[PDB]
Design a protein around this ligand. Structure first.
Ligand SMILES: OCC1(Nc2ncnc3[nH]ccc23)CCC1
Ligand SMILES: [Cl-]
Length: 167
């Protein structure tokens, strides 16, 4: 039993809800919140900009030190950093950004990072301003993640469309 509330159950381990991931994280304070990151951990917009804003820029400060030490992530890769006031940990995961010409096949690799954590709150990777089809992202999530994932989906038209089209 966990404290996630109001989710629709899609499969044994995947759940989905129309929600602002920032507001969800503050309420639940999950062990792991997933950020829709880029390789530079520059949290400007989309989910990343919203999460970082909610941390009063502490996420960005921590991220800049991480990059200065370790260099950029790989597309499809991840790192674990602090969750600040939102979660115990933040798993920064880089899905491919179609508006940059990045290979969509890397979306499966990106979701594989979720399997290192028993329970996660997360957005749909490569959706939103990363330019991929959210229906496709949901399919890859369901077919790749085996741990318990709670998917937030801020946009309402996307959520109903995602629920109504799910196979
Ligand atoms: O899930 C991916 C999508 N973006 C978000 N989801 C959940 N919470 C969010 N907060 C800010 C952006 C955001 C892209 C379409 C939904
Ligand atoms: Cl977005």
């Amino acid at each position: 039993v966990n404290s996630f509330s109001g989710y629709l159950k899609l499969t044994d381990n995947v759940y989905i809800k129309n929600a602002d991931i920032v507001e969800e994280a503050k309420k639940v304070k999950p062990t792991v919140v997933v950020n829709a990151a880029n390789v530079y951990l520059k949290h400007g917009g989309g989910v990343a900009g919203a999460l970082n804003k909610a941390t009063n820029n502490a996420m960005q400060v921590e991220s800049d030190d991480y990059i200065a030490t370790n260099g950029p992530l790989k597309v499809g890769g991840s790192c674990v950093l602090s969750g600040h006031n939102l979660a115990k940990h933040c798993l920064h995961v880089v899905g491919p950004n179609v508006n940059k010409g990045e290979d969509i096949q890397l979306l499966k690799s990106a979701y594989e990072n979720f399997n290192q954590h028993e329970v996660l709150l997360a957005p749909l990777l490569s959706a939103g301003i990363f330019g991929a089809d959210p229906i496709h992202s949901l399919r890859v999530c369901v077919d790749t993640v085996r741990t318990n994932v709670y998917l937030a989906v801020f946009d309402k038209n996307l959520y109903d469309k995602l629920v109504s089209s799910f196979l």
